[PDB]
Every structure is written in C-alpha cells, then in structure tokens.
Scaffold this active site. Structure first.
Site, PDB file in Angstrom:
ATOM      1  N   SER A 245       0.843  -1.217   0.000  1.00 41.64           N
ATOM      2  CA  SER A 245       0.000   0.000   0.000  1.00 41.64           C
ATOM      3  C   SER A 245       0.873   1.260   0.000  1.00 41.64           C
ATOM      4  O   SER A 245       0.366   2.358  -0.039  1.00 41.64           O
ATOM      5  CB  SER A 245      -0.947   0.023   1.253  1.00 41.64           C
TER       6      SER A 245
HETATM    7  C1  LIG Z   1      -1.661  -2.253   1.601  1.00 41.00           C
HETATM    8  O1  LIG Z   1      -0.550  -2.586   1.948  1.00 41.00           O
HETATM    9  C2  LIG Z   1      -2.872  -3.200   1.737  1.00 41.00           C
HETATM   10  N1  LIG Z   1      -2.317  -4.528   1.845  1.00 41.00           N
HETATM   11  C3  LIG Z   1      -2.906  -5.537   1.100  1.00 41.00           C
HETATM   12  O2  LIG Z   1      -3.855  -5.521   0.365  1.00 41.00           O
HETATM   13  C4  LIG Z   1      -2.119  -6.826   1.270  1.00 41.00           C
HETATM   14  N2  LIG Z   1      -2.444  -7.724   2.161  1.00 41.00           N
HETATM   15  O3  LIG Z   1      -3.551  -7.448   2.933  1.00 41.00           O
HETATM   16  C5  LIG Z   1      -3.664  -8.376   4.016  1.00 41.00           C
HETATM   17  C6  LIG Z   1      -4.827  -7.997   4.969  1.00 41.00           C
HETATM   18  C7  LIG Z   1      -2.354  -8.266   4.803  1.00 41.00           C
HETATM   19  C8  LIG Z   1      -3.929  -9.829   3.452  1.00 41.00           C
HETATM   20  O4  LIG Z   1      -3.656 -10.789   4.196  1.00 41.00           O
HETATM   21  O5  LIG Z   1      -4.408  -9.888   2.303  1.00 41.00           O
HETATM   22  C9  LIG Z   1      -0.935  -6.970   0.334  1.00 41.00           C
HETATM   23  C10 LIG Z   1      -0.403  -6.055  -0.500  1.00 41.00           C
HETATM   24  S1  LIG Z   1       0.951  -6.718  -1.401  1.00 41.00           S
HETATM   25  C11 LIG Z   1       0.706  -8.299  -0.552  1.00 41.00           C
HETATM   26  N3  LIG Z   1       1.512  -9.402  -0.800  1.00 41.00           N
HETATM   27  N4  LIG Z   1      -0.310  -8.276   0.308  1.00 41.00           N
HETATM   28  C12 LIG Z   1      -3.696  -2.726   2.977  1.00 41.00           C
HETATM   29  N5  LIG Z   1      -2.859  -2.026   3.963  1.00 41.00           N
HETATM   30  C13 LIG Z   1      -3.242  -1.675   5.113  1.00 41.00           C
HETATM   31  C14 LIG Z   1      -1.953  -0.546   5.993  1.00 41.00           C
HETATM   32  O6  LIG Z   1      -2.297   0.600   5.883  1.00 41.00           O
HETATM   33  O7  LIG Z   1      -1.113  -1.282   6.437  1.00 41.00           O
HETATM   34  C15 LIG Z   1      -4.513  -2.132   5.806  1.00 41.00           C
HETATM   35  C16 LIG Z   1      -4.800  -1.687   7.007  1.00 41.00           C
HETATM   36  C17 LIG Z   1      -5.418  -3.127   5.067  1.00 41.00           C
HETATM   37  S2  LIG Z   1      -4.731  -4.048   3.747  1.00 41.00           S
END
Ligand SMILES: *C(=O)[C@@H](NC(=O)/C(=N\OC(C)(C)C(=O)O)c1csc(N)n1)[C@@H]1N=C(C(=O)O)C(=C)CS1
EC number: 3.4.16.4
Length: 508
Positions: A245
């Site tokens: 993100s």
């Molecule tokens: C950004 O980093 C967002 N992350 C995701 O969509 C990813 N995983 O989400 C989780 C909930 C960890 C999952 O198990 O699917 C992602 C991105 S690249 C990858 N390999 N996984 C959001 N970021 C946040 C933040 O601000 O940290 C959130 C609170 C919700 S998900």
C-alpha cells in the site's frame, strides 16, 4: 654473501568516519609474531619453550614447524600487546620475529556493521563500504631493497625504492547519532513483535544522503566467529519485498497529474470487494461506500485505488513509479544491491492494473522505497542517492511536478493526523506524513511504514520494515508506525529541526 631482493611495504588503510568525523573503521596497531621455519629448524632445542609461550602443545608445534620447513614465513600469533610480543622475543629464539601491523577495528561494532562491512585477513575489503570503496581506502604498498641470507633472513636493509602511499579518509553520509537511535528502536520493535528481521532507512530529502541504514539481525564485526550469513545481510539494500500500500501515493500522484482527479473527488468502494473475472480485489475495512481520495489512503482501500487506476490507465502509474525509482537501479554500487522488479506488460488488463496500483507483485528495496518518498517530500525533485558525505549537492531530477507532489504531501499528512488515520505515526512536536503497508507473504506478514517530516518543510524521509511479526498485531500502522514516530522524533531533534506543530490562535 646473500641475495638482493625486493619486499613490500604495506600501506595504512584509510579511516572511515561518519558524516561528522566519528570513527567507524580504524586500522590500529597490533603486535604480531611470525617465524621463518628455515631458521627455526636450526634451533629445535628452543621449540618446547616457544610452544609453551604460544599456548601450543609441544608435539603439535614441533609437527607444524616440520610440515612448514620449506617455507620462509608462517604466522605464530596476531593481535598481541607490545608487552606480550616482547615476552616471546625474550626467549631469543632464532627465526622468531615481532612486527607491528595495522588491523581493522570497528568502534561502533554491530550498530553500523551492514553499512561499513569489513576486510579480510589480507586486509582487503570484502563486504559493505569496505569493499565498495576499497580502492579509495587501500592505498598503495611500497617496496624496499634487502639482502637475504640462504634461509631468507633479512641481513641488511639496503634502501627504500618506493614509499608506501596511505589510503584516504572516507566520510560516510551516515549520522552515527541517528544510526544508534535507529538501531536501538528497530531492535526494540523486533522484541515487542517477536519479529524475524527488519530494516530502517533514514534519508535527507534535500541532499540524497543516507543518514541511517540499520537491519536486524546484525553481527559484531570485531568478533566474526561462526557468523551466520543471514545476520550479515544488509537487507535494506540486498533484500527485495512487496511494497504493497506504500506505493499508493504514487498511484495517487498519477491520478492528480492526469487532470481527472482532485482530492475531494469521491469513489464508491462498496461493498469492500471488486470482482475482476476470477480475481477479487478486497479491502480489509468493508464498512465504506463513498470515500474521497484522502479517505482511500486513510482506509488503505485496495478497491478505491484500483477504480482510480482503471480510470487513468496503468501506464501513467507505472511511469510515476519508474520515475521515483521503484524497481530501478539506484546506481549506488553497494555489493549485492538489488534492482528489484516493476512488472511490465504490453497491454494492461484490469487485474494487472489494479495490483500495480496497490503494490502487489512488485519488488523493491527499502533504500528504493525511502528514496521515492524523499523525492515526494522534496516537492517532487529526486536528489541522487549517496552513501558518502555530500558537501556540494548535485542537481536533482524533477520526477513529480511540484504542485502534484505538494498535494500528495498534504494528503499523507492527513493519513497520519486525521480522524481514523495512522495515529501511532504522529511525531510529538511536529507535523508528519506517510503511509502504512501490510503485505501477506505468499500466514506470514511484512509490516511497513514510509513517511517524512516535518510536513511544513520536509527534511527527513524514513522507511520502517518489520519482517514477520509474530504477535497478534501485524498491520503496518500498529507494528511499524510507532517506530517511525520514535525515530523521526529523535532524528529531527538531533538535527535541530524546529518543531512545527504549534497551535493556531484559536486552538491555543
Ligand atoms: C496495503 O498494503 C494493503 N495490503 C494488502 O492488500 C495486502 N495484504 O492485505 C492483508 C490484509 C495483509 C492480506 O492478508 O491480504 C498486500 C499487499 S501486497 C501483498 N503481498 N499483500 C492494505 N494495507 C493496510 C496498511 O495501511 O497497512 C490495511 C490496514 C489493510 S490491507
């Protein structure tokens, strides 16, 4: 009699300091005992007392000398005090010699081990800065003429034919005060979260200087006994990870630059999922319908950023991330430094457009991520990275226009300060800005926060990476944001940056 020979004069390796002259790698004298086995073979009667003075078994020592009887140089022991070397020389054994040699000591030890690296026992740089700047640091050995007897013993010093040239002092960009603070707080975060590894990078957004670069696990370069290679990794430069993100502000920069989006524009993200054929984009918070562009970042809505990406096209987003350096060669030349991968396609379908926009499937380093946030903070201008102290700042490259950069900066300040935002990243006394990330490893997680401060006139950009926290908390805004707060708060005060979070007349 004898034979005329030329032997080398070792050169004194240059001092490595931090940006303020604090010693980080110093070549200091140690006393070393060496032996000419050809001479030792003429005085076997003296061997047992020599062995005992060296803490060696008499027969193992007698065997070692016999096995090297045709050599003219073997080490006995390196690293004694001058008093210790004299006690053995006091045995007056023919063929035993004491010399003073300069060997590396690292006064900050584990704290800057990944950046500085070390030398080998031939004293040639083999890791980190010691390797990358070995030519600068090494100097040039000299030569002198001697006469050697039939056993190789120097029986007269004739003349010096060429003087040694010492290596040159090197001042790194690292600020040891920030490095210590970053090191301690990254270590603390690993314990509080039971994490496996982590990195923390601090950059000067105006000069491109790497002010701090620390990783866990680390190692003591003064005691390299059975070092595990995992502890030696300068992860900030040689490990790649999915930024997730934390790349959304660059997607948002492309949105604002397109002419089709303003911060107050609205996106419907209900019901928190978006089906793209067999692929489903999902948000964690799914109690939203209309969000404005700042709310998309505050909630970190993958759905919201994806719909924006469909509107403006993946090409515009890819170009911003390329321009700010994600997955692009830094050019620094650190040993093993990775370039990473910004995935590219001929035509971008919806799935690939969405995943690019929220950082899924990308590979970057913490150095790259910090440099990209430095350019954003610096009103869109990217100053070239440097591991060494920068006196004359080189010209930068405008990679995001100043107006778009300034608007995204303000949005990121809201991410940290607005209601429902990443409040644990708030920096006491200052306005700060940034973005959290949480990446599921392909359950294991990587916890990210990237940001800069002070918002009114940015000085420092910082990236915190926590690899595989094992407690109940794993989201970047819980795990990594508080590290950003503590390290940014201390770094700004150490650099005498005036606090800028002061009340208005009406808030006072
Ligand atoms: C950004 O980093 C967002 N992350 C995701 O969509 C990813 N995983 O989400 C989780 C909930 C960890 C999952 O198990 O699917 C992602 C991105 S690249 C990858 N390999 N996984 C959001 N970021 C946040 C933040 O601000 O940290 C959130 C609170 C919700 S998900």
């Amino acid at each position: 009699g004898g034979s005329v020979r030329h032997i080398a004069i070792p050169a004194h390796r240059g001092l490595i300091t931090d940006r303020n002259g604090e010693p980080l790698a110093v070549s200091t004298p140690v006393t070393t005992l060496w032996a000419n086995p050809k001479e030792l073979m003429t005085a076997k009667e003296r061997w047992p007392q020599l062995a005992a003075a060296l803490g060696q078994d008499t027969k193992l020592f007698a065997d070692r000398i016999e096995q090297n009887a045709e050599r003219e140089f073997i080490y006995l022991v390196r690293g004694l005090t001058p008093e210790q070397g004299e006690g053995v020389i006091a045995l007056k054994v023919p063929g035993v010699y004491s010399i003073e040699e300069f060997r590396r000591f690292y006064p900050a030890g584990e704290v800057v081990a990944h950046a500085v690296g070390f030398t080998d026992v031939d004293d040639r740089g083999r890791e980190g800065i010691e390797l990358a700047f070995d030519e600068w640091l090494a100097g040039v050995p000299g030569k002198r003429q001697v006469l050697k007897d039939r056993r190789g013993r120097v029986i007269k010093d004739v003349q010096v034919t060429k003087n040694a040239k010492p290596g040159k002092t090197l001042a790194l960009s690292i600020d040891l005060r920030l490095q210590y603070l970053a090191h301690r707080e990254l270590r603390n975060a690993l314990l509080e979260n039971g994490a496996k590894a982590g990195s923390l990078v601090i950059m000067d957004v105006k000069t491109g200087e790497i002010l701090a670069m620390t990783n866990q696990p680390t190692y003591n370069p003064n005691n390299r006994r059975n070092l595990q290679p995992a502890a030696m990794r300068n992860r900030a430069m040689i490990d790649v990870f999915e930024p997730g993100s934390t790349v959304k502000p660059f997607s948002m920069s492309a949105a604002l630059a397109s002419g089709r989006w303003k911060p107050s524009d609205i996106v419907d993200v209900y019901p928190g999922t978006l089906q793209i054929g067999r692929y489903t984009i999902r948000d964690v918070s799914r109690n939203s319908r209309q969000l404005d562009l700042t709310g998309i970042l505050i909630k970190s809505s993958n759905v919201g950023i994806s719909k924006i990406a469909f509107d403006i096209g993946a090409e515009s987003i890819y170009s911003v991330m390329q321009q700010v350096g994600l997955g692009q060669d830094t050019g620094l030349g650190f040993p093993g430094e990775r370039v990473g991968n910004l995935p590219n396609h001929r035509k971008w379908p919806k799935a690939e457009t969405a995943t690019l926009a929220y950082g899924y499937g990308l590979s970057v380093t913490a150095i790259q991520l910090a440099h990209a946030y430095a350019a954003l903070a610096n009103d869109g201008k990217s100053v070239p990275l440097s591991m060494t102290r920068v006196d004359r700042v080189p010209d930068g490259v405008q990679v995001i226009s100043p107006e778009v950069a300034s608007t995204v900066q303000g949005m990121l300040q809201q991410v940290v300060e607005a209601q429902g935002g990443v409040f644990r990243a708030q920096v006491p006394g200052y306005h700060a800005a940034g973005k959290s990330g949480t990446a599921r490893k392909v359950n294991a997680y990587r916890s990210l926060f990237a940001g800069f401060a002070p918002a009114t006139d940015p000085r420092i950009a910082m990236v915190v990476v926590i690899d595989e926290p094992s407690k109940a908390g794993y989201f970047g805004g819980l795990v990594s944001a508080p590290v950003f707060s503590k390290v940014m708060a201390g770094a700004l005060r150490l650099m005498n940056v005036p606090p800028d979070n002061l009340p208005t007349e009406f808030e006072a």
